[PDB]
Structures are given as structure tokens and as C-alpha cells.
Curated annotation (Swiss-Prot), chains A, B:
Cofactors (names): FMN
Free-text comment on the cofactor: Binds 1 FMN per subunit.
Temperature dependence: Optimum temperature is 37 degrees Celsius.
Species lineage: Eukaryota, Discoba, Euglenozoa, Kinetoplastea, Metakinetoplastina
Designated name of the protein: Dihydroorotate dehydrogenase (fumarate)
Pfam families: DHO_dh
GO biological process terms, semicolon-separated: 'de novo' pyrimidine nucleobase biosynthetic process; 'de novo' UMP biosynthetic process
Species for this entry: Trypanosoma cruzi (strain CL Brener)
A single MF term (Gene Ontology): dihydroorotate dehydrogenase (fumarate) activity
């Protein structure tokens, strides 16, 4: 058995990709993700100018997942754009480029320059509206009027299909409002659910200390902690956005977890924490495990079960 | 070594209590909590009139925690007031009564009636502003203006010290706003952080089905999933509300987990999912495990380490 997605006028070998921020900062990282068996890759969220990020330690992992306060760090937009325009081998797999400007004007500036490269090469924009680790600059998609302004301005400057990296929500009214804002924008063709569960806090009992340095130890959560939250957000936006794709992200360590994301509605499945911890070998494992679950159940295609999670009575 | 606390004009043998909703709905449940080694108990959140709650199954537990959509179920306010007035043995431990009206008016109606019993018996009010399982009635404390209205009306009607059960927040701006609301009310003497992480979704891979019946499977998360979220909220409010007490709730299975809550700023420590799964014998275990950690560290009292989590640099 194999798989075949045809999403966003691109062909994908399988639904797996990295999560933005993991194994995708440097040229070396991007070449490693390209050489892996993932179906696609996404670059690290960038600002217009290069930045260093927050002070170390800024990422820590544990048996149930990870906490991070990475904050700015990226080589800057010029580098990721060059990667997209001159360096990426599109014959190997599709590329997504993630942007996370600090203001609407910064995002607009970047997308005006990305557009020609999108037209020429087919790089796909993921607009990050959910970073939980910039002090003073909370998650844009938690402010629905701000979200609307960003999407209006980006859609007008960019003019081409794009997607949005969403924070998790926890309230039905918020699902309803958020999805309705997204559905105002026809150029938003995919929605990635979710970014990290923001501003958790891990404490080490022995040392009586937080484990990351920035923001008094507060950071976004990934990994096993977040799987039910991720699944809820995938399914909530899958139900509410029938004319868009939903990409799942959060808590994927196995083909079974991927299967659950796809049952909830996911088209592509992104891997963050588990990829940071296991490395890019994880992609052959996840595909082998997903194909085995499909074979046991008699599923030949992803379409046979995507979004087909059952409810009770 | 000592687990004793003296707070809110009451003496507690230890900081442990049930979380509202767990082992506290019937008279039988309340007697069993009273008979346990807990330092206190809290009654099931009540509405003015009795309710049945949502269709079953409405609670499920897993190795990493639980999901629930209990929704309304309670014997009604009259029953819990009667228990406070006539049945509870205050010589054994203090009682908290949780209320969760569906409107500000219903809450106000209850607290007007509670007030004389609080005064006479010393029962303590916990006002629930965070239930994630009523369709059309999202978490009140996610709407800061609604929160303020409720606290103003309840403060005026009740006129006595009370506490509030808060939802988890995920955004620094939300912590700042929420705490500033709470700090407008001097009668809010304690803040319980946190209620369930709302609107998660658990899916069973074999059956391809959600595991609870209401709300298409969506429900609030407890247990191991939520400990870093709970610690963050406890510390965020501990830092922002220096004139109030913070009670910790979320993810407690061990004395070590309780130690982390206390380092983060918790006074009382509430136990939901783990008590639902293990039963009331958990409180002797939690006490022994917390005293073991204190002995190893040389700590003689809770106040020697409460709120003393260390940050880096
Ligand atoms: C070290 C690290 C850095 C991250 N940086 C970004 C980022 O640049 N852009 C972004 O959209 N998400 C970022 N994220 C969030 C992840 O893309 C993903 O949404 C999150 O980790 C949850 O998925 P998981 O449970 O597989 O980790 C980052 C996560 C980690 C762990
Ligand atoms: C079966 C069940 C019923 C609950 N009912 C209530 C409730 O009536 N009032 C309330 O404030 N919280 C209620 N909760 C939330 C818990 O008090 C607690 O905040 C949550 O379960 C997180 O703690 P934990 O990680 O120890 O489970 C309920 C939780 C469960 C599991
Ligand atoms: C923040 C995004 C940061 C960034 C820096 C340059 C451009 O964007 C993060 C995010 O979105 N999710 C995370 O879990 N961690 C982050 O630091
Ligand atoms: C909802 C509150 C239910 C209630 C019933 C009578 C009055 O209020 C819940 C809550 O606060 N937390 C939960 O985890 N579960 C609930 O269903
Ligand atoms: C995320 As990296 C460039 O330290 O593998
Ligand atoms: C050495 As290993 C845990 O990458 O099999």
C-alpha cells in the first residue's frame, strides 16, 4: 500500500511533515528534513530581520512532552526566502514557509516579497498567528479583531492561497468565532491546529526550580500532554470549515496518534516534540505504523477515514 | 514536621481536599470525604434546582488522565445548604460549598440564602466561574466583563469572604487581565486554579469513536495531561494576587505533585481525577509522600517553601 495526497495543487508521498520550529532553522536542518521520508517540510517561523531568540535553556523534554520558550530565533526572512527560491529541491517534496512578524505591517512586508517566489516555485505560506513566547506580543489569534486585521491585510498583499497556524482553543464559543473569522477569507486554504499549549510551567522537584530561563519558566507545551487538545481543535475546525483543509499538529508519537488526527479531520499531520526527541528517522516509523493500522482495519486510502470519527448515539 | 494550615479563620490538618465534583455529590459521598484523611472537602457545584446532568457515558479515565462532560448533575442547592446547615460535622474538617448558577441572577439568589449559614456555621463559598460543559453557556471567566459583573453582584449579595474556581488560561495578557479583575474584589479571598482544561477530545483508535456521549465527545481534561497548565496558573495568580490565597487543582497524583503545587504558591491542594480513580485512601498516601519529601529537604512546615519556586538568573 502507499498513499497519495493531492492537496493545494501539490502531490505528497505521505501526510507527514515536521512541525514549524523543529528541525528546520538552518540550511543543514532543511536539507535533513528534505532527505528524510517525510511527505513535506516547513521552515522555522521568521521575522523580517534575523534574531537570536530568548536566553538558554529554552527547550526541555520529558516523558510526557516538552516545554519551550524559544522566542525569536531565526535566520531572518531573507534566508528562508532564498532557501525557497534557490536551494530547495522541489522534486523531492513540497515546502511550506512559516512567517511570524511582530505586527501586521511586518507580515505584509514579507508576504509581498514571498508572492513572486510562491508564483514561480510553489512554496506554500503558513502564517503563524499563535506564538506564545514573545513578551508583550500575545497570541494574535486570541484577539479576534486583530486576527481579522492580519488576515485582511495579508490576503490583500499576498493574493495567493495560504494557511494559518492556530493556537488551541478551549471554549465552544471561541471555536465558533475563530472559525467564522477564518471563513471570511477564501485565500485561507488550510488551518494548522495546533501550536503549543501556551504558558505552561514545569517545575523540577529536586532543584525546586523552573526548567527554562525566559519568562520566569513559562513556555508552550507540546507532546503527550496536548494530544486531546489537538484532536479537539482539528475536529472543531474540520466541522466548521468545510471549504478548507485542516492540518493536525500536537501529540503525534506513533502511527496510531496520526490515525487519530486523520480520523478527527487532518489532511497533513505535523510532528514537533516527538521529532525533536527521536530525529528524522521517526518518519519511516510513523508511515510503517500508519500503514499497518490501515491494513488491519481494511482501509486502502486516507480518504476512507479522514474526518470519520464516530460520535455516540 | 507539620502539614497544618491556618487560613480563612479555619484550621486544616493538612492541605489536601477533593476537587469539586469528585466524591461529593450525595450525602454518602460527603460523609465518606469527611471520614477520610483529607484536610477539607468541597461539595459538588450546584444549581438552584436539582438536575440530572448529561447522558452516559460522561466521564472516562486513562493512564494520562480523564475527560468529562458531566454537565448539570447535582441534588440542587437546597440539599447542599441543608448539608452545610444540619448534617456536616465541622469538628472533623472545614467544608466548602461550590455553586454554579446559570446566570448571575441564579448565583445571586443562592448566595443570599447561603450567607446566614456561612455566618453561623463557617461553611466557605467556592464560586464556580469555569464549567466547560454547558452548551450555550461558555466559561464565564473567559469573558472578563461577565466575570466582573458576576463578582460585583455576588460580592454585594453575599457580603462575606468567598473564593472563585478559575478556568485555566494560556496567554500572559489573560493572566494579567484576570488577576486585575479579581483584585477589584476584596471579598475574593482565595482563587482555585484550575478547573478542567476545556473541550478536549479523546478518540479510541480501535472503535474509531469518541469515548463520552455529550457534545460530540468534547469534554474537560484532568489528570496528568494538565499538571504543567495547573502549575502555571497557580503561580501566575500567586504572583499577581499577593493579597489573596491560591488553591491548586490539577494533575495531583502524588506528594511530589502536591509539593510542586505548593512551591508554585498553593495553600490548599485539590485532587480530582486521581481521587476519582483511586478513592479516598489517596489522602493518606499523599500526606505520607509529601512528609517524605519535606523530611529529605529539611522542611518543617508548608510555609517554608510555599511560593518559593526558583527562576533561572
Ligand atoms: C523547539 C520548538 C520550536 C517551535 N517553534 C515554532 C515556530 O517557529 N513556529 C510555529 O508555528 N510553531 C513552533 N513550535 C510549535 C510546534 O510547531 C507545534 O505546534 C507544537 O510543538 C505542538 O506539536 P507537538 O505536540 O508535536 O510538539 C515550536 C515547537 C518546539 C517544540
Ligand atoms: C467527574 C468530574 C466532575 C467535576 N465536576 C466539577 C464541578 O462540579 N465543579 C467544579 O468546580 N469542577 C468540577 N470538576 C473539575 C475538577 O474540580 C478539577 O478542577 C479538574 O478535574 C482538574 O483536577 P484534576 O487534574 O485533579 O482532575 C469536575 C471534574 C471531574 C473529573
Ligand atoms: C514563537 C514563534 C517565534 C518566532 C520567532 C521568529 C518568528 O516566530 C513560537 C511558536 O510559534 N510556538 C512555539 O511553541 N514556540 C515558539 O517560540
Ligand atoms: C460543570 C459544572 C457543572 C455544574 C453542575 C451544577 C452546577 O454546575 C463542570 C465543571 O465545572 N468542571 C468540570 O470538569 N466538569 C463540569 O461538567
Ligand atoms: C533546531 As536545530 C538548528 O538546533 O536542529
Ligand atoms: C540510539 As536510538 C534510542 O536513536 O535507537
Amino acid at each position: 500500500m502507499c498513499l497519495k495526497l493531492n492537496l493545494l495543487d501539490h502531490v505528497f508521498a505521505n501526510p507527514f511533515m515536521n512541525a514549524a520550529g523543529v528541525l528546520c532553522s538552518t540550511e543543514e536542518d532543511l536539507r535533513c528534513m528534505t532527505a528524510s521520508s517525510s511527505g513535506a517540510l516547513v521552515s522555522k517561523s521568521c521575522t523580517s530581520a534575523p534574531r537570536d531568540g530568548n536566553p538558554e535553556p529554552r527547550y526541555m523534554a520529558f516523558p510526557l512532552g516538552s516545554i519551550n520558550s524559544m522566542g525569536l530565533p531565526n535566520l531572518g526572512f531573507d534566508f528562508y526566502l532564498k532557501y525557497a527560491s534557490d536551494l530547495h529541491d522541489y522534486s523531492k517534496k513540497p515546502l511550506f514557509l512559516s512567517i511570524s512578524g511582530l505586527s501586521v505591517e511586518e507580515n505584509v512586508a514579507m508576504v509581498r516579497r514571498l508572492a513572486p517566489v510562491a508564483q514561480e516555485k510553489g512554496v506554500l505560506l503558513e502564517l503563524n498567528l499563535s506564538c506564545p513566547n514573545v513578551p508583550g506580543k500575545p497570541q494574535v489569534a486570541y484577539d479576534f479583531e486583530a486576527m481579522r486585521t492580519y488576515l485582511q491585510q495579508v490576503s490583500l498583499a499576498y493574493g495567493l492561497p495560504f494557511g494559518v497556524k492556530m493556537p488551541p482553543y478551549f471554549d465552544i464559543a471561541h471555536f465558533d468565532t475563530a472559525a467564522a473569522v477564518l471563513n471570511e477569507f477564501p485565500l485561507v486554504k488550510f488551518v494548522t491546529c495546533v501550536n503549543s499549549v501556551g504558558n505552561g510551567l514545569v517545575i523540577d522537584a529536586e532543584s525546586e526550580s523552573v526548567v527554562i530561563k525566559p519568562k520566569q519558566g513559562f513556555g508552550g507545551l507540546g507532546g503527550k500532554y496536548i494530544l486531546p487538545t489537538a484532536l479537539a481543535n482539528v475536529n472543531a475546525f474540520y466541522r466548521r470549515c468545510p471549504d478548507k483543509l485542516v492540518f493536525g499538529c500536537g501529540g503525534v508519537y506513533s502511527g496510531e496518534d496520526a490515525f487519530l488526527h486523520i480520523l478527527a479531520g487532518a489532511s497533513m499531520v505535523q510532528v514537533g516534540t516527538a521529532l525533536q526527541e527521536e530525529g528524522p528517522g521517526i518518519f519511516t516509523r510513523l508511515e510503517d505504523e500508519l500503514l499497518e493500522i490501515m491494513a488491519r482495519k481494511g482501509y486502502r486510502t486516507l480518504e476512507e477515514f479522514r474526518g470519520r470519527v464516530k460520535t455516540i448515539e
